[PDB]
Amino acid sequence: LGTLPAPSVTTGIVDADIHPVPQDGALEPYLDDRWKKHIREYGVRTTTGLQFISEYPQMYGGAMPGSDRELLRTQLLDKHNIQLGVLQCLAPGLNPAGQALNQELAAALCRATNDWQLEHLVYPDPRMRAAIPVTFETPDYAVAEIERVGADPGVVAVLGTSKTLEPLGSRKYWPIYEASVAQNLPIQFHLSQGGGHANTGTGWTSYHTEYHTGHVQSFQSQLLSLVLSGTFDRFPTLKVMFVEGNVAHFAPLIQRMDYTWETLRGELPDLQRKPSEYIRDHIWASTQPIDEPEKPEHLAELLEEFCGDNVVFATDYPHFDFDDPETAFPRSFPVDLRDKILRGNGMRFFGVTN
Amino acid sequence: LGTLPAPSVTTGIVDADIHPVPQDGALEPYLDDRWKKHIREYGVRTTTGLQFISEYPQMYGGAMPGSDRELLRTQLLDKHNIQLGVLQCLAPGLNPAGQALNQELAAALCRATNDWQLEHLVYPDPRMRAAIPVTFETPDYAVAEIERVGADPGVVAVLGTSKTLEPLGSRKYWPIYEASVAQNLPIQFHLSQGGGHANTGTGWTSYHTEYHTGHVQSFQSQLLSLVLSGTFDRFPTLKVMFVEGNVAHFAPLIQRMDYTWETLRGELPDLQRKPSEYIRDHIWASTQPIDEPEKPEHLAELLEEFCGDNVVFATDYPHFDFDDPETAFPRSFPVDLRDKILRGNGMRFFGVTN
Amino acid sequence: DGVPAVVDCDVHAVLPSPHSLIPYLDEYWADQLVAQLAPTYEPNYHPRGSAIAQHSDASVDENGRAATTAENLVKDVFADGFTDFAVVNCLYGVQQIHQPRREMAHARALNHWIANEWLDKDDRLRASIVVPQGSPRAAAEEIDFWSGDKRFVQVLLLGQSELLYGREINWPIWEAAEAAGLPVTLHIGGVFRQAPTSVGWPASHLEWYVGQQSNIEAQLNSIISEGILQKFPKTKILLSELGFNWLPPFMWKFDKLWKSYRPDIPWVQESPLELIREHVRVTTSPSDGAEEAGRLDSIVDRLGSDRMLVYSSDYPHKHHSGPRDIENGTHSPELLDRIYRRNAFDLYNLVVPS
Amino acid sequence: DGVPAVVDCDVHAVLPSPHSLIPYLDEYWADQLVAQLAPTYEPNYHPRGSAIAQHSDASVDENGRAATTAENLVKDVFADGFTDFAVVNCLYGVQQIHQPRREMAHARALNHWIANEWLDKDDRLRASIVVPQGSPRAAAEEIDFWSGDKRFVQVLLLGQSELLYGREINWPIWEAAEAAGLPVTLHIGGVFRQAPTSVGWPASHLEWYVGQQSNIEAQLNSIISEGILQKFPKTKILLSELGFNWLPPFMWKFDKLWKSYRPDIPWVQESPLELIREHVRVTTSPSDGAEEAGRLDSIVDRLGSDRMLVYSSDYPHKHHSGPRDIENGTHSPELLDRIYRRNAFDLYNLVVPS
Ligand SMILES: [Fe+3]
Ligand SMILES: [Fe+3]
Ligand SMILES: [Fe+3]
Ligand SMILES: [Fe+3]
Ligand SMILES: [Zn+2]
Ligand SMILES: [Zn+2]
């Protein structure tokens, strides 16, 4: 690695969610041989009884400088004037690194991935920056990794998963937030599987409609926890973003939260503010996959009802449901709202100076 | 509190599990009014949807100085020459204090209980000592409580529950072990409910036979975790005892463990010893409810097969299935084994000098 | 013909004590109950001391409790003459009895208590059939059993179940409800046999209560995706005390993913948008902010149907907003007439008596 | 009459790939599978690279894998002439397909692959019926379907299920097995729809593998307590690759608690001690230390019956001890004759052919 400038966004856009198309032995020069042998013998054991796949496969997933950079440069970065593209590598290669039941292996794989995306994508083309995967279920290792590479300017955020063993407001994770706030880093939680419980609070889903729609639910529960535990009283500078868990649903969820709090606030007397008052400074959300109301004017209504300043654009390239910054919004969409979704809102979240 | 001597056991016996029959307002002089009001409004929320009871009631539970001391003195301590009676108060009053989903409440209730059993039972009759309940699911609070009262000579152990959110070998609990080893305290894990998962690894039990027999299973899983995580490599002085999770089953479980390890040890290369080799210095177990083989000579066989030095007597007074130090063993039982179950084995576990 | 009546679609009878079921139990279960020390399955859905438990204005019994007698309930619910009928839901926690035969017996006893002590005492009262959710075939027999008593107007289920209600093992309930001509309602509350969220246990009653909307999204997706509405085309679903403002973003996403995945659930040939609009109804208390100026008009608009909301007071629970405050959120007398009379007529067929 | 044959009660066919099921699928499911990028449900019960996966001595295919063809399996299993029949279990993870109709279709295809590619190729082979565990009524139909082919000799279930196998929703399997005259086996492996232990997720394959004996205690208690043996009195159960040395302490405790709780399960009038001895059989590989001097005699003695153990090699898995090393643990030729021939005759009725 040489040296990098802080990210810059002027007339291009922010893209919060990009999944770098990796390569096979790519991680092997960053893994010690202990874990090479261990992976050769056991794979990456997770919250399944499956040797290779996750509990909910995709049902059609697959298509198509050097490695994979030129395609990313020309298909995505050049094509869409992306000045800040945040890389979110959850699979070595499709289960999250941090979710490996062997947590020492998981931290080795997290380490290998961070060294790899930095050297191979960010530093060669610093329009891309990394959200570094860490082992959220072993805070000690995650703190160590945030300290190892978090201060590098190639790193713009800490990367977690929507599904966890305890809700993200639980004290188990406060050391990770404390380390993040020390590195001046925000945290992104990506839609994921696993985590240790069923994919809903009331059983496992059957068909692909329940599975993929169900992903918003984990996010609904993580917002409630993070807010009503007082996590944002303890860490008043912490910014978190929910990624690929759509946006519009958060608005009626927060609306219900305040409504119930008006009656039951006595249960949580240390909570310093009204619950919806924490959204502005602490909770962002990315757009992909965009919400598609029957009447398209409802989209801008609900995004503003969540918070118009805290919604950030993402492509989710190269997934099948990827969003295009042109096509994704309806044509009556307010121009000022769209512009700050593309530029300003992400700029504030990631800390890039105007 | 005045001052106390270290416990002394000469010709009497050790009783590892005694449940002090508490009183209603007893904890109120040790609870701040915040939690008084909070308990008045919400009870003690736990891993159920039940306002008062636990998910598996007893189906016949109930019977019958000052408060409750004289009955304990004369019915139990005097009657059985008990020189070291370890108090294990899991209910304020029957769900464990530490298991309260409001963990701040749970630490307040743990605090209130520790101050109460110390002042009300131990110091008035120091034949009784306390195993102090802590909040195992919030290590920070549990460390704080081990440091607040753990050095008091009225305290002989740290008290936990058989059911936990993660297996006890998980790093989540290592700060608690580190604090315990610093206070020169062993840890007792009592049979419990709750913990956050079903009462077996494959669903919830239906009838009372499955429920009460099923309690050994949680212990089987906690032994495997505690040993195969290398927890006893990291804390080579740590002693833990499984309480009211019978004894005999541990022997074939450990036997299977070594057998499987002979083939799959490669998965865990940092593990310093053969798995059964950790039993001697780290794993004890209490006797109640005594195992009752069809051929009574199998009892001594299996206790020795677990480890003859690590089995400790307990009455579980005043529960219905309580054991009598006379009646509990069969008459062919080897006299030397019985004597150290009554005296020496517990003496070593609790650190009372010969 | 005739004018559809104003039906209060959700009010509660509070069982004074488990003792109240003894008259309706067989001698076997009566002995079990008396021998068990009569453990109460009073739920924690509305903690008896919390602000949501009861109104300050409510009629109470000698122990300060609201809604434990029909006399107290009728005196409050009907006092102003606006309501013609109230649908009674008793949420006593028989669904949390783990012993399957005891769950059967207490559920039948609870229904007997409702018939004789509530429905018999006032002909303006109706009720739902509490069912033993743990054994669907037995729940179907409990529905058949009461199908002959037209005062029982719907089938009661909890928002959180053991397996999602679309799973085939749950079809006997849907079939039996359809053959009895009864809507199935889902009321907030759960069996608590997994963590109430896909990311673990919520730490406060407040957090649990707001978040239960997530489980209802999972249930509606399970019910529709698995084919319940094609298999049982006359099924009606009522969501009781579960909010409604979360519905539109859920419906939009579900419809988006149904189009992307139609071959995976070929039995689903109508749009989930339309199925939900035609088959799902929702009570109005709590209103969760829909009572503010224009917000009722906005939500109906986003819902895409004025036939979904049915009036309820949720007596005797206290909410930030009162049973008739929804009028401040609409300017359309026609909409208010559908919420008070016309929509509930689709569920119960109750015309104003004389 | 005739001499009962030496039956190897547990050997494995390894599905080479999900592609191998395409010939047996309907065009609907074949398209789904081809479109899905053919995700493989190869389990992690025996990680393909781990030491337990296969013997060094084993016949392999062009990819180094053992037991993917009948030709390789027959060549090893029967090479020395000692075995007359082998019962084939394919553990390909169709039970972990969450889509219930796809689970049905792949289970039937797997059984078709077994019949045509294994049972057809050699008449010394038998198999179990893989069943769609997620829909018990469909699993009963899968049993009915193959009941006409006497080469299928037992019903395959995993040690870990979604709900315990005594629960009423699972009775269609017990009924169908009984009507087909087939024993039900439980083989190590799980659906992984809750944590594999009551205290959470085990961190290594080793820890998971040893601990699965705990789930089998929960299953045997569920099956007996709920009345399966009274309801289906001819039921036979085989425990496959699950150890046996844990049985006696479990049986003693279960019997103790049955006596203390007989009115709670009145259908259980025989002692669980006797029921287990009469209805449960257990394969001998792994032996878990029973192969050491005297240990086979000791365990039979503790078991209280010489009719429970049946011979198995567990081909092609590697265990610390070999299929016939159990002879070093007994001095009784009569016992060895029951383990090799007489006990399995209770399951399959296989006499030595000519
Ligand atoms: Fe993404
Ligand atoms: Fe994506
Ligand atoms: Fe006890
Ligand atoms: Fe006890
Ligand atoms: Zn209600
Ligand atoms: Zn096997």
Numbering used by the authors:
A (entry chain B), B (entry chain B): 9 to 72, 83 to 111, 115 to 375
C (entry chain A), D (entry chain A): 27 to 380
Question: What sentences appear in the manuscript?
Answer:
Here, we discovered a three-component monooxygenase system consisting of AibH1H2, AibG, and AibF for Aib hydroxylation in a Rhodococcus wratislaviensis strain possessing an oxygen-dependent Aib catabolic pathway not dependent on α,α-dialkylglycine decarboxylase. AibH1H2, a non-heme diiron enzyme, acts as the terminal oxygenase in the three-component monooxygenase system to produce α-methyl-d-serine (D-MeSer). All previously reported amino acid hydroxylases that form hydroxy groups on an aliphatic C–H bond belong to the Fe(II)/α-ketoglutarate-dependent dioxygenase (2OGDO) superfamily, but AibH1H2 belongs to the amidohydrolase superfamily (AHS). Thus, AibH1 and H2 are α′ and α subunits forming an α2α′2 heterotetrameric complex that act as the hydroxylase component in the Aib monooxygenase.
The crystal structure of AibH1H2 hydroxylase was determined to a resolution of 2.45 Å. AibH1H2 has a heterotetrameric structure of AibH1 and AibH2 subunits, and each subunit has the characteristic (β/α)8-barrel (TIM-barrel) fold present in all members of the AHS. The AibH1 and AibH2 subunits interact via 36 hydrogen bonds and numerous van der Waals interactions. The structures of AibH1 and AibH2 align well displaying a root-mean-square deviation of 1.75 Å for 294 residues, despite the overall amino acid identity of just 28%. In AibH2, the two Fe ions are coordinated by side-chains of three histidine and three carboxylate residues (Asp25H2, His27H2, His211H2, Glu265H2, Asp337H2, and His340H2), an ethylene glycol, and an oxygen atom. In the binuclear iron cluster containing oxygen bridges, the distances between Fe–O and Fe–Fe are 2.1/2.3 Å and 3.3 Å, respectively, and the Fe–O–Fe angle is 95°. AibH1 contains one Zn ion coordinated by side-chains of two histidine and three carboxylate residues (Asp24H1, His26H1, His201H1, Glu255H1, and Asp328H1). Thus, the AibH1H2 heterotetrameric complex contains two catalytic AibH2 subunits, each with a diiron center, and two AibH1 subunits, each containing a zinc ion. Although the amino acid sequence identity between AibH2 and Streptomyces platensis PtmU3 is only 25%, the residues needed to bind the Fe ions are highly conserved. The Glu313 of PtmU3 coordinates to an Fe ion, while the corresponding residue (Asp342) in AibH2 does not directly bind to, but indirectly interacts with, an Fe ion via a hydrogen bond network with water molecules replaced by ethylene glycol in the crystal structure.
